[PDB]
């Protein structure tokens, strides 16, 4: 909630509720129920379980952004589900406004609406250009609208994932 209300135009679905920067509880005198058992990184990552931590200042935090997405695709993150949930909600009010409307110009108005809202998305950085120009190109969002008859028009949109830098490893060395 804090991450989403810190921004007013597009919100903070791009950020995660993880780390002491956002996620802090530190209720009081935190101690484990059972000291014998220990967590296992492979166990929690396979079981989609979120492990806890304590921050640099010493407050109890949750250092995880993992959903119940059992499949190991990009949907296992938290910003991805939030981002298309938000954009789908945007489609919700846009369908709300264009519903029952006489044809002819509604498609075009929706086109400009989609482009401008994706533009503010990329300006917010919630959407980024593809990392591979050869196949995915270097264009963030692709839109297409088609019509078939009195009914059966379709709108399709494609976007690009954005990094969050979950796993980071450091290596030491002696200059000798």
């Amino acid at each position: 909630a804090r991450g989403v209300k810190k921004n007013s135009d597009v919100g903070g679905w791009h950020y995660s509720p993880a780390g002491e920067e956002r996620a802090v509880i530190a209720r009081a005198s935190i101690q484990p129920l059972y000291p014998e058992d220990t967590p296992d990184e492979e166990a929690m990552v396979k079981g989609r379980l979120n492990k806890v931590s304590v921050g640099t200042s010493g407050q109890m935090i949750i250092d995880d952004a993992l959903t119940c997405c059992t499949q190991d695709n990009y949907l296992h993150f938290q910003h991805v589900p939030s981002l298309m949930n938000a954009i789908s909600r945007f489609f919700v009010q846009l369908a709300r406004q264009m519903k029952h409307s006489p044809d002819g110009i509604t498609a075009a108005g929706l086109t400009k609406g989609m482009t401008k809202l994706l533009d503010r998305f990329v300006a917010s950085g919630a959407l980024v250009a593809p990392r591979d120009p050869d196949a995915d190109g270097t264009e963030p969002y692709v839109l297409k609208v088609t019509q078939a008859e009195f009914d059966k028009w379709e709108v399709v949109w494609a976007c690009c994932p954005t990094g969050v830098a979950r796993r980071i490893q450091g290596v030491p060395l002696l200059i000798k």
């Binding site: 007013s8 135009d9 597009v10 401008k116 533009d119 503010r120 990329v122 300006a123 917010s124």
Partner: protein
Amino acid sequence: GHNNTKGNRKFIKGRYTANAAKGERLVSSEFLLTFAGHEDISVLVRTSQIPEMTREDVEDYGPNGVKFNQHGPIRNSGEIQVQCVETIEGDILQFIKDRIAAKDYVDITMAATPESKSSGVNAVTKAATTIEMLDCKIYSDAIDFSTEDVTAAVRPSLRIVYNWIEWD
């Protein structure tokens, strides 16, 4: 001509969208500055000064004459020139009259109130944008009235000083 000349569109569109995502902006002319319980004189304000909050700095030196500065307390002082225009009944003169008679302090509040955002019977205000000046000294300053240029009416101005910046 020069080789490093290529340009495109998507950068300027991205920056345009970024800078337009801010929203509208508050105009200098739209705000509200009022006294404590004297709104009928408060409405006579014409132009004012933003309150300021700042901190003293200590300027120490390190060796071979290098320098370094350090934070201090707040500079809580503040001065504002206030502008008003006076009517026949002299609301301004009776106000200056009675508080210079009282020989006491005055309390002020200053918050920008856009009409578009305003709702309800009267403009609604939030504590984020509310700024209140209490324990203030209001005095008069010598403002020349241009009798030659008749096209301009009286131009009363006063000066208000606050001892401390009241901020939530």
